[PDB]
């Protein structure tokens, strides 16, 4: 309940994703996505690639960007 964590991940073979949790450490950030996400019954498909904290002092900037192309599909 301390820090905010934005995640860029990639569900394996299904698509790509963008998520955001609230946990104390980034290992629990992947816990709260693999058990509360929409792939609950296929939690092994979640492959989290980048976790960075939501830090304040800019407060105007991107945190996640993950586009699915017609050439990736």
């Amino acid at each position: 309940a301390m820090q905010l964590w934005v995640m860029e991940y990639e569900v394996t073979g299904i698509g790509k994703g963008c998520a955001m949790c609230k946990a104390i450490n980034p290992q629990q950030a992947e816990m709260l996505l693999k058990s509360n996400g929409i792939y609950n019954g296929s939690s092994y498909l979640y492959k989290v690639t980048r976790i960075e904290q939501v830090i304040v002092p800019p407060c105007n900037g991107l945190m996640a960007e993950q586009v699915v192309t017609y050439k990736d599909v």
Binding site: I14, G17, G37, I38, Y39, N40, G41, S42
Partner: protein, 456 residues
């Protein structure tokens, strides 16, 4: 497809000016509890005399054919799969069956009926429990029967028992059968609460995510959450007995906690398939083969009961099946996916929208659909589906296969008041207790398609 969290439920151990209303607001950004009362009361009830286990009569069918165990030539050597033709020139040979079923002078046929008919020359000679008939062919066949049509696992039925027209002696015999029975069990439930009118220590507040972020009636909540005890025990309960009749779990006072299976553990003993992706190649060919052997052609109506998102998975899959029909051109004249709705904005103003709520298979099978709102339960069903929902809404349940003249599913009941209530003033504890049980008579008449993520 992505979810954004609109509420959070927290326990109270982790935490007057005027009002704009005197009725408490209940937001749509809050999940709500669901009764199983609409689901359970769709079934009738039945009254019993006592809490003894109860049984009834089970009637089957009669038309048998006996599988073959082995076939032997006239010297006793067993015919192999790669052997030559057996019984050539109407020479006698033996035919070993696991039961004494056919009689003297009777004509029996293999998997190929009437092509190789065998005439039985005498009574059954017992080989332990086996029955060995010395048979010979009855079709004018000079080359005999092939060795593949004399192997283990070939069905043999009876045809007749012919004789010669003069001086003959007695042939043939007759056969009898018998029925079986089945039992069922009961379950008792108990609740308590240490209590007037105020809350106790098991509390949970709900805080909604908006942008710039009374008094309890205990006599209603104990009845409601003991109603939910008897709604989860009737429907979502399980059995804990052996095949030796022993119970596996023992209570506080040494006695065994006796439980019986609910609805969903009795109806899942038959006609239950676990799919990963829904397709009408699977549902149509499983509903036809259930209806090809069991249902008449007029009586082939299946009302699929499903959730909310299981209706849109049935909508977008029939639409996949229909869009592959290259023969027919679907127009807006007949189907009317775009119609004329009167509007102020234009003289000819249109609309849009449709949903496939039914599918009709060949040989009279019609697959209807309806939405049962208890499949969308956020409390009980917690494993999510990527297309929205809680993955239990994607479960298809066919109740009421055919007509029976009696109910197949009912809720058993003791005559009168099987509920108990009791207060224990010391400590002030309200105790309540009740017995129940749900009997599914023939679980072959209930079919279920459950998603593969809800198993094992």
């Amino acid at each position: 497809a992505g979810k954004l969290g609109k509420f959070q439920m927290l326990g109270f151990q982790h935490w007057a000016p005027q009002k704009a209303t005197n009725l408490m607001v209940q937001l749509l950004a809050f999940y709500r509890g669901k009764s199983l009362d609409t689901f359970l009361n769709s079934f009738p009830t039945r009254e019993f005399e006592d809490d003894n286990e109860y049984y009834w009569d089970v009637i089957g069918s009669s038309r048998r054919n006996i599988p073959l165990v082995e076939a032997r030539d006239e010297n006793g050597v067993v015919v192999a799969a790669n052997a030559a033709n057996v019984g050539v020139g109407t020479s006698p040979f033996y035919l070993v069956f696991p039961e004494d079923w056919f009689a003297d002078g009777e004509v029996i046929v293999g998997n190929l009926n009437q092509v190789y008919p065998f005439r039985i020359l005498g009574d059954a000679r017992m080989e332990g429990t086996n029955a060995v008939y010395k048979v010979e062919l009855m079709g004018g066949n000079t080359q005999g029967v092939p060795a593949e049509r004399l192997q283990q696992g070939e069905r043999f039925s009876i045809e007749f028992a012919p004789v010669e027209k003069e001086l003959s002696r007695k042939v043939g015999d007759v056969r009898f059968t018998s029925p079986v029975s089945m039992r069922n069990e009961w379950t008792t439930i108990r609740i308590q609460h240490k209590v007037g009118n105020k809350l106790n220590k098991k509390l949970a507040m709900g805080i909604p995510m908006v942008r710039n972020l009374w008094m309890h009636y205990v006599d209603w909540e104990v009845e409601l959450q003991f109603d939910e005890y008897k709604n989860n025990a009737m429907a979502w309960g399980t059995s804990n007995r052996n095949l030796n009749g022993e119970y596996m779990n023992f209570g506080k006072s040494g006695n065994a906690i006796k439980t019986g299976a609910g609805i969903f553990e009795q109806t899942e003993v038959a006609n239950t398939m676990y799919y990963n992706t829904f397709s009408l190649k699977l549902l149509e060919d499983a509903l036809y083969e259930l209806s090809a052997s069991k249902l008449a052609m007029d009586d082939r109506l299946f009302v699929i009961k499903t959730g909310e998102r299981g209706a849109i998975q049935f909508h977008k899959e029939v639409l996949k099946t229909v869009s592959g029909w290259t023969t027919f051109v679907l127009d807006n004249n007949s189907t009317r996916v775009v119609e004329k709705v009167q509007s102020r904005l234009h003289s000819n103003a249109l609309s849009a929208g449709f949903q496939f709520v039914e599918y009709k298979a060949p040989n009279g099978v019609r697959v209807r659909l309806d939405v049962d709102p208890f499949y969308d339960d956020p409390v009980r069903n917690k494993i999510l589906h990527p297309m929205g929902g809680v993955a239990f809404s994607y479960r298809y349940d066919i109740w009421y296969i055919g007509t029976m003249d009696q109910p197949n599913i009912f809720k058993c009941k003791i005559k009168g008041d099987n509920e108990y209530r009791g207060y224990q003033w010391g400590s002030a504890v309200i105790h309540r207790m009740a017995t129940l049980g749900v009997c599914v008579l023939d679980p072959t008449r209930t079919m279920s398609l459950i998603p593969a993520i809800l198993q094992g």
